[PDB]
Amino acid sequence: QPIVIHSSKNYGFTIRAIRVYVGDSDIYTVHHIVWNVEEGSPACQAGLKAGDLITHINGEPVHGLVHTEVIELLLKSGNKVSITTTPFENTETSV
Amino acid sequence: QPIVIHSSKNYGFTIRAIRVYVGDSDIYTVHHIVWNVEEGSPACQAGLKAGDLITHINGEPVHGLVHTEVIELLLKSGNKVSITTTPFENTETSV
Numbered sequence A, B: 001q002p003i004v005i006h007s008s009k010n011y012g013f014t015i016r017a018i019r020v021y022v023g024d025s026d027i028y029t030v031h032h033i034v035w036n037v038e039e040g041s042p043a044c045q046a047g048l049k050a051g052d053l054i055t056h057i058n059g060e061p062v063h064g065l066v067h068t069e070v071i072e073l074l075l076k077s078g079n080k081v082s083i084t085t086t087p088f089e090n091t092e093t094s095v
Helices: A042-046 A067-075 B042-046 B067-076
Strands: A003-006 A013-021 A028-037 A053-057 A080-086 B003-006 B013-021 B028-037 B053-057 B080-086
Touching (some): B003 B042, B013 B067, B053 B067
């Protein structure tokens, strides 16, 4: 962390907005997930993985940003981009 | 596959429903994620992996089922439950 991707075109991945619901409730949290990583791509080489939640692009937090805003961050990045990711699973400890 | 869990009355895992949206649209698909697996439980013993998605319960597909319906499939199950899972893998056939 972060994942550094060097491009010569594209980075080679797609992202999707998700909602994660708790139990049977209507309450959710909003995230951006790496949906697919093309094999042989800079993103694939760099170790970016499908299912990874993105928290930052080039150090900028994606919290509160809508899908198109995140895409825009990736597009203006140009040739090299840094992506901070976190596991998509429970990371907390109960006592 | 599938994961075979040998319970007694708790399997030892938590599930969440997630919505994955297409682009900037309001269209989504639903996925049932293994959110947490309790150490030292039947689910842990069975090798159920947090972060993976449930596709079948005792051979029955979960497409089109909401959270409470997936719960019911698990409750109606006996001591042993077979769960089919898949990781996030959205690789396309590109030529």
